[PDB]
Amino acid sequence: KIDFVLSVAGGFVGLGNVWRFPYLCYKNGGGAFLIPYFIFLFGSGLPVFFLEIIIGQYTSEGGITCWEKICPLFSGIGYASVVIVSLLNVYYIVILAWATYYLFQSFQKELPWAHCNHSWNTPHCMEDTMRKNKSVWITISSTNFTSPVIEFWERNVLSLSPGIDHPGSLKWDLALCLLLVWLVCFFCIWKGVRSTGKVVYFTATFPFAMLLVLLVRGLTLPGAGAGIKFYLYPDITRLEDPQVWIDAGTQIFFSYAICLGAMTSLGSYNKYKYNSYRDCMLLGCLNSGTSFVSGFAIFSILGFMAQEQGVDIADVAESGPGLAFIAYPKAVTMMPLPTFWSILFFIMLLLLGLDSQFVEVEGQITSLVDLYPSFLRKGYRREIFIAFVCSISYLLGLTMVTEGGMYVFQLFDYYAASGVCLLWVAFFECFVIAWIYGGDNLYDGIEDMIGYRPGPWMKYSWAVITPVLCVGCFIFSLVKYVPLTYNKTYVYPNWAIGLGWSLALSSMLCVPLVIVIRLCQ
Ligand SMILES: CC(C)CCC[C@@H](C)[C@H]1CC[C@H]2[C@@H]3CC=C4C[C@@H](OC(=O)CCC(=O)O)CC[C@]4(C)[C@H]3CC[C@]12C
Ligand SMILES: CC(C)CCC[C@@H](C)[C@H]1CC[C@H]2[C@@H]3CC=C4C[C@@H](OC(=O)CCC(=O)O)CC[C@]4(C)[C@H]3CC[C@]12C
Ligand SMILES: CC(C)CCC[C@@H](C)[C@H]1CC[C@H]2[C@@H]3CC=C4C[C@@H](OC(=O)CCC(=O)O)CC[C@]4(C)[C@H]3CC[C@]12C
Ligand SMILES: *[C@@H]1O[C@H](CO)[C@@H](O)[C@H](O)[C@H]1NC(C)=O
Ligand SMILES: *[C@@H]1O[C@H](CO)[C@@H](O)[C@H](O)[C@H]1NC(C)=O
Ligand SMILES: *[C@@H]1O[C@H](CO)[C@@H](O)[C@H](O)[C@H]1NC(C)=O
Ligand SMILES: [Cl-]
Ligand code: NA
Numbered sequence: 001k002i003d004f005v006l007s008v009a010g011g012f013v014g015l016g017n018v019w020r021f022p023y024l025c026y027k028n029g030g031g032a033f034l035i036p037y038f039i040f041l042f043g044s045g046l047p048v049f050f051l052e053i054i055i056g057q058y059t060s061e062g063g064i065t066c067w068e069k070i071c072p073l074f075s076g077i078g079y080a081s082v083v084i085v086s087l088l089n090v091y092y093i094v095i096l097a098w099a100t101y102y103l104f105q106s107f108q109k110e111l112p113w114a115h116c117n118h119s120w121n122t123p124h125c126m127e128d129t130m131r132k133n134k135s136v137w138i139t140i141s142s143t144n145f146t147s148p149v150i151e152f153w154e155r156n157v158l159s160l161s162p163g164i165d166h167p168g169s170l171k172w173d174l175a176l177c178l179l180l181v182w183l184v185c186f187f188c189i190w191k192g193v194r195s196t197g198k199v200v201y202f203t204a205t206f207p208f209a210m211l212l213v214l215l216v217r218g219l220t221l222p223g224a225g226a227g228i229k230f231y232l233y234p235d236i237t238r239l240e241d242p243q244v245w246i247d248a249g250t251q252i253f254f255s256y257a258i259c260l261g262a263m264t265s266l267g268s269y270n271k272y273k274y275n276s277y278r279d280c281m282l283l284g285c286l287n288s289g290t291s292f293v294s295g296f297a298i299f300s301i302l303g304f305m306a307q308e309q310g311v312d313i314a315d316v317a318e319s320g321p322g323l324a325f326i327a328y329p330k331a332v333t334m335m336p337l338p339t340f341w342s343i344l345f346f347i348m349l350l351l352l353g354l355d356s357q358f359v360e361v362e363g364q365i366t367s368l369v370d371l372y373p374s375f376l377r378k379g380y381r382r383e384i385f386i387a388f389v390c391s392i393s394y395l396l397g398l399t400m401v402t403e404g405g406m407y408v409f410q411l412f413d414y415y416a417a418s419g420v421c422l423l424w425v426a427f428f429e430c431f432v433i434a435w436i437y438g439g440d441n442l443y444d445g446i447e448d449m450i451g452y453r454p455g456p457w458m459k460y461s462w463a464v465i466t467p468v469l470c471v472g473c474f475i476f477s478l479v480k481y482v483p484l485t486y487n488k489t490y491v492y493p494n495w496a497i498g499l500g501w502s503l504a505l506s507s508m509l510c511v512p513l514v515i516v517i518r519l520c521q
Contacts, residue, residue, distance in 0.1 A: 004270060006200060008283055011266060011359055012257040013207075014352040015095060017291045022298035023323035024251055028244045029314070030299070031234035036248035043469060045252040046284045047461035048426055049263060051433060053276050056267025058445050063261050063367050066268075074432045076514030080425050081261040082367055083507045085360060088260075088417035090397045091409055092360070093185075096353045097178040097401070098325060101157060103346040104177070111338055112156070113329055116148035120155045132310045147309065149326050150318070157325075161404035164411075164496055168403020175401055182394050188358055189365075189386060195355075203351065210348045215293055217331060218300035227303020230313050231295060242477040249473060250418040255291060256284070259425040262363050275450050301327045320487050321406075321413055365389065407496075410486050415500040420474065421507040427470035428511060434462040 025033045059066040064078035105112050112118065116125040126136060128147050136145065154160050161168045187193070195203045218224060238244060253259060270276065305327070306313040317326050328345060335341040365386060369376045376385065400409045433442070439459040447453055483497055492500075 001274075004266075005279070006195075006204070007269075007359075008266060008279075009204065010355045011262060012255065012287060012356075013290060014356040015092075015349075016255040016257075017287065018211075018294050018349075018352065019095065019321075019324040021251055021255065021291050022295060022327070023319065023321060024247050025231070025295060025299075026302065026317070026323060027319050028247060029235050029238045030230045031232050032236075032238040033234075033244055033248055034232070035234055035239070036245045037251065040249045040252045040469065041288060043461060043465040044249075044426060044430070045256055045258075045288075046281065047458055047466070048253075048258050048430065049256050049284060050277065050280045050458065051429070051462065052258065052263040053267040053270075053280050054442065054446065054449075055433075056264040057270045057272070057274070057276055057449065060268050062265030062268045063370065065370075066264055071432050071436055073515060073518050074428065074436075074511075075518075076511035077259075077425055077429055078261060078367075079514065080421070080507050080510045081259055082364070083510060084417045084421060084425070085260045085262075085364055087412065087503070087507070089357075089360060089364065090393055091400065091412040091416065092353075093178065093181060093357060093393075094397060094400050094409060096181050096350065096357065097174055098157060098322075099346055099349045099353065100177045100181055101174060102325070102329070103343065103350070106339060106342045106346060109339075111329075111333065111342065113149050113152040114333060114338075116151055118152075118156070120159075121148075121151050122146065122155075125151055128305070128308055132308065137310060142310070149330055153318070153322055153325055158406055159403050160406055163490070164404050164407035165493065166404055170398070170402045171405075175398060178394060178397060178401065182390050185354070185357055185361065186386065186390050188354070189362060190383065194358075207348050207352055210345060211290075211294065211297070214328070214331060214345070215297045217335060218297040218304075221300055221304040221331075221334070223304045223307030224300035225303070226307060226313065227299040227301070228296070230303065231299035241482070242473055242480060243482065245469075245473050246419065246423070246477055249469070250422050253422040253426060254418060255287060259422055259429070260360070260363075261367065262360070265363060265366075272449055273451075277446075277450060277452075277454060298323070298327055301331050305330060315488075318487065321410060361389075407486055407490075407492075411484070411492075411496065411500045411503070414484050415504040416507075419504060420477070421504050423470045423473060424508050424511075427467055430462050430466040430470075434459070434467075439463065 055066055055070065056062055059069060061069075063082075064075055067075040067078055115127065124144050125146050125148060130136070131145065131147070136142070157174075159168070159171065257263065267276065302316060303313060306316040309316060317323055329342070332338055332342045332345055368389075369382070369385070375381060399405065400412070439462065443453065443459075483492065484500065485491055
């Protein structure tokens, strides 16, 4: 019970609610993102999560083992999830590397991004406190100016190249930060160091307090009403593009850590005769509320920056993966004693990232050791195996810390553990569960375990709402095609789009291979 609650709280509350949701909501106009957000929430987000928990508790297994007894022909979902989490682990730790770099740069007397008198800055820079001044406003030369935070993030941390075709030279300091984070993760996993006893009280109450104070600071900031209006009121015409629907569905499937093979094991740890339904509903509501209030804070900050800079809200930031690193460092600057609050906030980010990183990597290593235990479970191989896995992941992720490392990271974010592959996996899971096993068969088990019969809503949500949404989104995306573009102006080469589609197809095509191999034998 207690361990279940703590593990599930640490299993999906983290970067997916604070970093990824805000920039996807910002890129799609704001309010128009919310209607598909809630539709997909109440259609599949809670039903599929509850289905995973129930199947884990019922089979007492996870990963491929549960599908090995639910449907042998449909065991490819486990392998697809393994590939998805393996590709996700590579690019999930670059955020932690950036956080470590920011934290190390925080120890100085003055924050580096508070001004742009440094040496890594273009001549087209000035301070936001007087950017709206008449001599430096729409009167003349108001289009090519830039804020110190944008220039810092684009040059000191990234040093962005003209394109992906020009990778430049490798940056060594970010490589060292990545190595340090990987070493910390290896030390934590090898010795089995997890929060226990009374320290978990602070570990759980610190991120919420930091989020609360950040929310208060953002709400008290002038010009946040425009940000709230942008975040809430939707655009009807914008809904005619499949982009909003597909990214809302993937945000639902990502924030809840669905289709990664983790919740099945989490429910497998549970025993029979437990009320999983109430806990699952409460956790889903808590996760959604946390994301909603985090969006409040982000868009209040964005509205403040848009009001102070003099430009429109739709284009005031990167509109890409690095939205948090532009909003939050700008927010922590307004607090008294900025250094202490910056250190606290980046420690909070590190804490929210490290626990999720640990649990995902541990689940991955358990999956691989279960895949071939014959000599893995015997001897001292269970240290060198993690050593090799960490080294390979570090080498693979080293390609995203070069001069042109942002484009590869954006391609990974778009095509690796999101987009069409997650919809594919969720559609297949819902289809098999609802149509081959039978909803009545699962309600029999639910009645046996929890002693009560829920309403006739899970059956519908698994039979008619999820497959229709998945198929509609896929078909409409295929019919109306718009190629991926970093930010909004950069157009990718043909081979880059081919590589991204190959990345997605690598996860997607595991299921047909499994089916054809099972049928051939
Ligand atoms: C970054 C991406 C491209 C990495 C891709 C590799 C991994 C996703 C791992 C995870 C599970 C692994 C598989 C787990 C089990 C097997 C079975 C085994 O192959 C056989 O000999 C087939 C018969 C058997 O099951 O033993 C060893 C390779 C293979 C396909 C592994 C190949 C590498 C896989 C796909
Ligand atoms: C191991 C599995 C999971 C595949 C992983 C592939 C990608 C994560 C990486 C591996 C090697 C990378 C490539 C290696 C070097 C370059 C430099 C550059 O290629 C060029 O066209 C260079 C031309 C020139 O230098 O003259 C653009 C990015 C590219 C192709 C990289 C794109 C991203 C790639 C394909
Ligand atoms: C096609 C392009 C996009 C490159 C894809 C590279 C990899 C992501 C592919 C190449 C070979 C694939 C593997 C080929 C065979 C299998 C075995 C298959 O399982 C079985 O057939 C029985 C169980 C077993 O032994 O694994 C599960 C998918 C898997 C691991 C595949 C996972 C995905 C792999 C590693
Ligand atoms: C900017 O830095 C230079 C030296 O690097 C210094 O001479 C100058 O006074 C600084 N300007 C401001 C406004 O701080
Ligand atoms: C604009 O520049 C002038 C010149 O120094 C200064 O007096 C004024 O305060 C500036 N306006 C703002 C809003 O900072
Ligand atoms: C900004 O204005 C134009 C934009 O095309 C550019 O040519 C000019 O050099 C820039 N001037 C300043 C002062 O930034
Ligand atoms: Cl979210
Ligand atoms: Na977490």
